[PDB]
Amino acid sequence: VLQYPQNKILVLSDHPHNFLKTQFLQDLFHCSSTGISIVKDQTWENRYYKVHFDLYIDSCKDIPVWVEEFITPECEPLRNVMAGIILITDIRQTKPQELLHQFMIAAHRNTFVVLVNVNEEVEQDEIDELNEIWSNAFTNVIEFVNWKTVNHNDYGEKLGLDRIQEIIDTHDWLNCEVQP
Template identity: 40%
Template sequence: MKRDKILIVFKNTSTTDKASIIYQIFGQCLQETNFKNDDSIVKNLTWSTKYYTTKFDLYIDQCDSIEEWTTDFIDPMCDLLRDALAGLIIIGEIPKDTSLISKSVVDQESFLIWCHNGNQIELNELDDLNLKMAVSQSQVEFVQLDNSTDKNDYHDKVGTERIKEIIDTYEWTHSKSLNTPRGQKKVLPPQDNLESILTQLQQAKLHYESLDTDSTDAEQFASELAKEIADKLGL
């Protein structure tokens, strides 16, 4: 099935703030539409990069409880929507109990972004949390919505710029490649795997040093990390 929908769900967000966040992420796509703040579906939007364009529909939802919303969303009645999702973006405070995220909220071929819009979280704490989720094989990535900078200490994009980067690098099933002028060498899309791996190794080094290197936890951590990096490299 063609995955051509992005679903963004807000927890307890005012109409004004909701529209502001949508424009931060999808503003370029909405320029030629009649988007209204209370719209729940915006069809036939265009996501463009220097390498491709693709058409998608934006679905917008709101809830009082992310936990209850996800419970409803993984019901078989929502199978058709989940199968059509390129990705799910959740806007709300990151829960203290991240086991909520371990549920198979979306298919493995879809991206899942949780955008924290509560009290500021230190970027290194967010990096550690993302590393923890990666080691546990969860596909979610946590992003802080409001940042004073566009990049972290590892020069990785953060905030809304990171959200756009995830959408940019998603493997759309129906994108249209842009032509390269004759005589100009074709430049391949940037692969974020290498940067991601280097960042992960830097974070892992700090985490590993905090463990007892003779412990079972350290051995398991190293084994899981090696497997994940090998998968990213296609080994």
């Protein structure tokens, strides 16, 4: 019934990429974490607005097992407060695209989902093909992004962390107080 302020961002990795996830948090959010934790009342600010959000940092041994738990009725309240979900993984190993249909069915329709690939052998053409499939599949902004990092393509679009920053900047923060 009630739509709670939707101001949580979950950053998840499978166990082998936990350290890279900690570096990602420093680079994008300027958050010096130690591991899995709840970091409250962070500020996301750009030239247009400021909004306050909570960072949820999690880890899992197996992505599908984590997805199964996330999709349950008991986790529905949690899903509904997610502004976004960022998964840091080797997409060749974990193939999160295989779980994405079922994951998105359960997700709140406004939640952004960014799948960050850290496997340096994956070229942008491979990412581009995944984005052609998923970027308009749902109401949600869904994007696969490589992170190693060139920050633009040949058509003047952003890539890398610059792109992820743009996705967060352009997000509609549902029932959050946004200040100029």
